[PDB]
Amino acid sequence: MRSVSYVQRVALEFSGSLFPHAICLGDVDNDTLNELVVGDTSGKVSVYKNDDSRPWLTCSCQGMLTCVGVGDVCNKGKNLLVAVSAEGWFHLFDLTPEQRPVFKQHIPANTKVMLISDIDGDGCRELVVGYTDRVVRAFRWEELGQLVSLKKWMLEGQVDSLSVTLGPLGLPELMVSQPGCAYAILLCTWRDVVLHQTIHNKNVSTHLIGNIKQGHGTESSGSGLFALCTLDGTLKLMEEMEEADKLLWSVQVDHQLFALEKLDVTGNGHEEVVACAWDGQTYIIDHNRTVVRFQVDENIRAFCAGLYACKEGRNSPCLVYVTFNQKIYVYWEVQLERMESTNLVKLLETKPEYHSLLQELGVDPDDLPVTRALLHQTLYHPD
Amino acid sequence: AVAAGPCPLREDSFTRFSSQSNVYGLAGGGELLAATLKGKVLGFRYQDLRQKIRPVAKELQFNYIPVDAEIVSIDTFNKSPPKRGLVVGITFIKDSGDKGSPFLNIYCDYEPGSEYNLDSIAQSCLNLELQFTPFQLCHAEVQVGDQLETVFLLSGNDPAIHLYKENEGLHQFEEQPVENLFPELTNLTSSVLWLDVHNFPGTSRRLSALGCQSGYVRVAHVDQRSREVLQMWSVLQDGPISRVIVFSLSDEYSVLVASMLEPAVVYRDLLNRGLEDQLLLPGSDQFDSVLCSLVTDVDLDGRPEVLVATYGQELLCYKYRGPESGLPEAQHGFHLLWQRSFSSPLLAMAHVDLTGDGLQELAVVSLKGVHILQHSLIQASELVLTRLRHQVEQRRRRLQ
Amino acid sequence: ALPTSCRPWLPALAWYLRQNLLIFLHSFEQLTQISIVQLEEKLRGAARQALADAIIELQLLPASLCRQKRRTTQLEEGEVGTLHPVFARVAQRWMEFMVQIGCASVSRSSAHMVSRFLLPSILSEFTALVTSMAGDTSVRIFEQHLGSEPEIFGPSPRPAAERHLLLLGRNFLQWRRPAMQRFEPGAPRQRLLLLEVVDKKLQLLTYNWAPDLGAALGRALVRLVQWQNARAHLIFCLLSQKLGLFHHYGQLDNPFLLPTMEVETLIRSASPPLFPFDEALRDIDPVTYHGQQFLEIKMAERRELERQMKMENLFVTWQQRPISAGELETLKQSSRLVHYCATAMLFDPAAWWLKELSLAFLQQYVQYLQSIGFVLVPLRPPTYHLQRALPGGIILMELAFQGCYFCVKQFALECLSMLFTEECDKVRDLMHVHSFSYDFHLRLVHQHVLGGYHLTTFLRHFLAHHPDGPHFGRNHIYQGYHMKPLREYALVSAWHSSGDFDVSLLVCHLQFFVVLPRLFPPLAAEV
């Protein structure tokens, strides 16, 4: 409903092409401080740390990275860097105290996306990949170690993103975007692919995110909310609940949305949905349909929102844009005191002791001019 | 050169402009007016919705400006309390020929009940040719007979100031000689970039200051009823005078001079020492040129501070460490309180209760648009609380 | 009549006369108290000037400007100490007094400096100028100590202050010795440079300089201040329009103040050189700091406009039907990757000679792409690229080989928004790389049937890799004495059944295989 103009930002030089899925942020050196991982098609992955313009480090794969990620895929309690190319290769990196990987294994080609999570509930983290031809494949790590294939699913509509959220039974799920503002639920890496629809062109590209926080300290185990975005410019937030989904809110914009992330800018535990368009019009919506629009006056190749360690060694919420002039912009003061717009008269009304503190003063807070005169006297004429 | 704390200002809204504005673009109204160079005028305000507020920026169309005319300056004021009315003045240039024709339009709806209606005022123009390039439309209030009269003042390309007084009988604004009412405003060499006329409340004296493109700054203590120059002082600085403001640090008057190539300075003890006690604000020339400036209370302490807006996108605030907390070796000084940053060069500001709470918002017009800044609501909410509880406790202790 | 004060100056005045006499005649006041009617007046002025010149030389300026040797140099060189009382008040007003009395050993000048930024930006230039015409002088800036009343000169803080200065230069090296100098011992023939500065008012007092060279120095100073004032067009149309005042202080409102004013040279090195400016910063020392950003602003748009026309000329050229490699790189950088597809190259054993098959595979797909309306992009004269220009934008394709896979990438560049996306996505549905690979493999399999590859192993590999079979292909394969051998041994044959579908049978040890893009009952009937 209101716009802002964030100011402080870090510009990082970055030359090369990339897919909207080859950028992420996470801890690779295992120090509770997030770095930025960017994977380009020329055969190089760059990790950015702190706020230096140059990359912190480079990783040399063999060809055409298509997805990158970080997580505990080897189930050793540590964090590792995973990179998948186009011909179905798979590279592992241990960046904890050039840069050839530590593990190589071939998988089916035509890779498009990535996800690392415990999908079943066995306590071991599995890897899920989506392909250009409506095929999804699950894997697991097994000590020898090696990647062992698992259930594999066929779909009809194009797959764009995979996510894991809590199901109605309190168990992890696996959801995949399906064109036409639809999505498919996969079933267990022990009829086979359930489909749901949420009217526009049936070939409209669609992206999905899931596992949205709802409180503080619930990050250990909790989900239930997921968001959908379409290229024609519609966004939706829904809740799994029990039988079918509940539509929490829907918004129609007039831009070409191509990304979907979650952040925490207010800092009150809840996570806000962050969307970006091709022309740079960023939307930030809380769970109460309080939109805040930012507009970087550029054209966007890729978008990424999350925690990042920029200055003074401390993780802060950040927005990340990739531009056509070989520049990555990191906006990091993006914390907001609030989402809506308000004033002192309304904010001071919420607190309860105000009406006692002013009734003891004889002034009945029924006349706004008297209240504002008293407040101006209190603030600007203390004596 | 180090901030003594955090900036308590949080951005509320931001309305983007298609084209840029100028330092005379900003004007009063609790509404705000911002005119673009290409004839675009926007009226900023806020609206209430239950337990929330919403910024509103609506476009206004003014009558007699052709589609090729370029707006140069705008000002506004209200008629003196004996009468009623809102007066707006726009000076533009009709680009007919290599050098355009300057024009002055004065909008004032004389019809009763619509003096303050800006929609009706938008088409009530009184076009007037100029024969000079206007620079700044200012307004002043003088004492004639026994009643106050608010008049216009306009710098011109000719090094002179032109007074435009209303004619009571025939309801029209006509030029009149300046030396009749403002004897200190004659015999100038450069064009007055900024002019300030400070009154002394309950006193027929006044303090006039002006700075021109040459750097020449002139201050005159002038009596009104006798229309004589009680005293006059002048200095010759380096750069064009972006701003001069007359303010009291607590007699005991002082001036603030904000140039474009020098740190902003404050001359103290005007009526007793003239222009010799020069306290310069430390490290205020490190952020390009000081375009705007403002003198108001930003810390809610009852004592003023100096706000300086620069072209390097900076919003410095300076605080006065007076001898009331005496440190004679350092007492009575200005130190950098805090500092903010922006995305575009800042061209103007106001200090106005846009929202309607009693707290003063700081509207900042920059190259790309208008930012509205509020005080940190959490910070202010508890400060009012503690001050109110202190007052209640001290009144219970006293009144018993 | 001569004063008795100069009793021992008899030789000295004999060297300042035969010196100041030879100007017209060819070959305070107390101490200096054929047209014959004016000849005496002419001859008296020469002696008076001689006495004055000797006074300065022998009684005013032999003084010092300001472990024992260390203080005997910093005092001599004026680096450490304080300026002598001579160069405080008497020297200036006496050298200037050498004007009313006719004397060709003293010059003068002036300047304006419409503002006083440029004093630092004039002093360095004057130092370089003096050193160029004469490296003998050494510039020392003896500013008056703030608040001090008189001679206090300690070798712009507090603005609106009429800063004093006594920029001085002297032949320090040629002490114990008083074509460069105009005069010589006819006596302390030493020269001196004094440049008094009073607020915004310059004043030169070059003394004993060469006449032509000294006048040149004064004129160069005049021109230098002229050029510095001309470098008030920051004041004119950078500072003024920084407030948004483009119409108020225009250009030309000085020899360097002409309608043809080279802005670039005067927002550069502060000197006289030996898009409209009036809206430059519209809707986008302090001289080289204020115009320097203007230069960057004016270059960042020239480069952008250089790129913008390159973006459009190719669009219009290709929309009707050997672009440089850098042009291709820029085109790819300005465009977004949208889709891609890759497929296996099974004939290579390693992915279980071959290059020629890959090139053959490369060509037959190129011909397919052209048949749906794609134009080959020729490589410029110092990996295949195809284009299809549309009103919505440009769609580009790339073909290349990495390892053992064939990859196709589809770029897009916008220029009714969905009128390009739908065009972009529709091409993706027509790539048909899988079906093309299917058909190419089956066709190449029929190039040994008709005449050391283990065809049985390759057939098993192909059957395992694509058990289903793409729906857009046309060829078909089925598993289960007019024969022909195959070096194990395999039997092959070929009958051209047209129930039209060329078919063949291959059998090896008894396993047999039958070998039979578009936008089977014959596969099984052949028994």
A90 and A225, same domain (yes or no)? yes
C-alpha closest to that of C368 among C416, C427, C291: C427
Instruction: List the single residue in C114, C158, C245 with the smallest CB-CB distance to B280.
Output: C158
A80 and A223, same domain (yes or no)? yes
Beta bridge partners of B319: B335
CB contact under 8 A, C402 and A324: no
Tell me the chain C residues in contact with residue A132 when contact means C-beta distances shorter than 8 Å. Answer: 339-341
Instruction: List the single residue in C336, C341, C407 with the smallest CB-CB distance to A301.
Output: C336
Handedness of CA C101, C102, C104, C109 (dihedral sign): positive
C-alpha closest to that of C239 among C230, C249, C229: C249
* C interface with A, Cβ–Cβ below 8 Å: 332-334, 336-337, 339-344, 402-405, 407, 417-418, 421-422, 425, 434
Residue A337 belongs to a domain: no
Tell me the chain C residues in contact with residue B260 when contact means C-beta distances shorter than 8 Å. Answer: 239
Q: How far is CA C121 from CA A265, C139, C287, in A?
A: 49, 14, 9
Measure the CA–CA gap between A204 and C422, rounded to whole angstroms: 9
Measure the CA–CA gap between C286 and C294, rounded to whole angstroms: 12
Measure the CA–CA gap between C272 and C255, rounded to whole angstroms: 10
DSSP C332-382: HHTSEEEEEEEEE-TTSGGG--HHHHHHHHHHHHHHHHHHTS-EE-PPPP-
- What the block records as the tokens of A165 is 């959220």
A264 and A305, same domain (yes or no)? yes
Instruction: List the single residue in A3, A343, A378 with the smallest CB-CB distance to B384.
Output: A378
Q: Please indicate the experimental technique that yielded this structure.
A: cryo-EM
Burial string for C504-517 (b: 16+ CB within 10 Å, else e) reads: bbbbbeeeebbbbb
- Total number of domains constituting chain A: 2
Q: Where in the sequence is the domain holding A69, given as residue range(s)?
A: 2-331
Q: Is A359 exposed, middle or buried (0-12, 13-18, 19+ CB in 10 A)?
A: exposed
Question: Is the distance from CB of C139 to CB of C127 less than 8 angstroms?
Answer: yes
A233 and A360, same domain (yes or no)? no
Residue A116 belongs to a domain: yes
Question: Is the distance from CB of B86 to CB of B31 less than 8 angstroms?
Answer: no
A197 in helix, strand or coil?
strand
C294 in helix, strand or coil?
helix
Measure the CA–CA gap between C239 and C254, rounded to whole angstroms: 20
Beta bridge partners of C207: C106, C192
Instruction: List the single residue in A64, A232, A324 with the smallest CB-CB distance to C402.
Output: A64
Taking CA–CA distances from A66, the nearest residue in chain C reads: C340
A183 and A248, same domain (yes or no)? yes
Question: Is the distance from CB of C97 to CB of C28 less than 8 angstroms?
Answer: yes
Beta bridge partners of A68: A83
Measure the CA–CA gap between A90 and A67, rounded to whole angstroms: 10
- Interface probe for C, chosen from A65, A110, A113, A281 (most Cβ of C below 10 Å), is A110
Residue A338 belongs to a domain: no
Q: Which residue type is seen at B2?
A: V
> Which residues, in sequence order, are CB contacts of B115 under 8 Å at separation 6+?
B79, B84, B85, B86, B108, B109
Residue A158 gets which letter from DSSP? P
Q: Tell me which residue has tokens 């590792």.
A: A80
The Cβ of residue A242 has, within 10 Å, a number of other Cβ atoms equal to 8
Phi–psi pair at C85, nearest 5 degrees: -65, -20
How close, in Å, is residue A217 to chain B by CA atoms?
A: 24
Neighbouring chains of C at 3+ CB pairs under 8 Å are: A, B
The Cβ of residue C496 has, within 10 Å, a number of other Cβ atoms equal to 9
Element (H, E) at A274: strand A272-275
Question: Is the distance from CB of C76 to CB of C138 less than 8 angstroms?
Answer: no
In C74-152, the DSSP E strands lie at: 143-144
Neighbouring chains of B at 3+ CB pairs under 8 Å are: A, C
The Cβ of residue B93 has, within 10 Å, a number of other Cβ atoms equal to 21
C1 to chain B, any CB pair closer than 8 A? The answer is no
Q: How far is CA B22 from CA A37, A194, B367, in A?
A: 44, 61, 8
Q: Is B212 exposed, middle or buried (0-12, 13-18, 19+ CB in 10 A)?
A: buried
C307 to chain B, any CB pair closer than 8 A? The answer is no
* A interface with C, Cβ–Cβ below 8 Å: 17-19, 41, 62-64, 86-87, 109-110, 132-133, 201, 203, 231-232, 256, 278, 301, 324, 326
Question: Is the distance from CB of A243 to CB of A237 less than 8 angstroms?
Answer: no
Pairing of strands B172-176, B9-16: unpaired
Question: Is the distance from CB of C251 to CB of C277 less than 8 angstroms?
Answer: yes
- Interface probe for B, chosen from A3, A379, A381 (most Cβ of B below 10 Å), is A379
A142 and A79, same domain (yes or no)? yes
C-alpha count within 13 angstroms, C-beta hemisphere, residue C179: 3
C352 in helix, strand or coil?
coil
Q: Which residue type is seen at C431?
A: M
- What the block records as the tokens of A278 is 């091709």
Residue A85 gets which letter from DSSP? E
> Which residues, in sequence order, are CB contacts of A54 under 8 Å at separation 6+?
A13
Measure the CA–CA gap between C42 and B111, rounded to whole angstroms: 86
A167 and A223, same domain (yes or no)? yes
- Interface probe for A, chosen from C335, C405, C431, C466 (most Cβ of A below 10 Å), is C405
Question: Is the distance from CB of B138 to CB of B126 less than 8 angstroms?
Answer: no
B313 to chain C, any CB pair closer than 8 A? The answer is no
Measure the CA–CA gap between B253 and B268, rounded to whole angstroms: 7
Tell me the chain B residues in contact with residue C114 when contact means C-beta distances shorter than 8 Å. Answer: 214
Beta bridge partners of B348: B365
CB contact under 8 A, C235 and B240: yes
Measure the CA–CA gap between C526 and C520, rounded to whole angstroms: 10
- Count contacts between B and C (CB, < 8 Å): 81
Q: Tell me which residue has tokens 């006329």.
A: B197
Q: How far is CA C448 from CA C349, C361, C455, C487, C496, in A?
A: 17, 17, 9, 11, 15
C-alpha closest to that of A33 among A333, A313, A319: A313
Q: Which residue type is seen at C27?
A: S
Residue A339 belongs to a domain: no
Measure the CA–CA gap between B287 and A291, rounded to whole angstroms: 34
A18 and A162, same domain (yes or no)? yes
A243 and A348, same domain (yes or no)? no
Tell me the chain B residues in contact with residue A383 when contact means C-beta distances shorter than 8 Å. Answer: 302
A350 and A217, same domain (yes or no)? no
Burial string for C317-328 (b: 16+ CB within 10 Å, else e) reads: ebeeeebeeeeb
Domain segments of chain C: what residues?
A: 68-230, 234-296, 325-431, 437-525
Residue A239 belongs to a domain: yes
A325 in helix, strand or coil?
coil
A372 and A267, same domain (yes or no)? no
Q: Tell me which residue has tokens 């500013």.
A: C143
Phi–psi pair at B52, nearest 5 degrees: -160, 165
CATH code of residue A254:
2.130.10.10
In B213-368, the DSSP E strands lie at: 216-223, 229-236, 241-247, 254-259, 265-268, 277-280, 290-296, 305-310, 315-321, 333-338, 346-349, 364-366
A319 and A364, same domain (yes or no)? no
C-alpha closest to that of A185 among A267, A262, A240, A117: A240
Question: Is the distance from CB of B260 to CB of C239 less than 8 angstroms?
Answer: yes
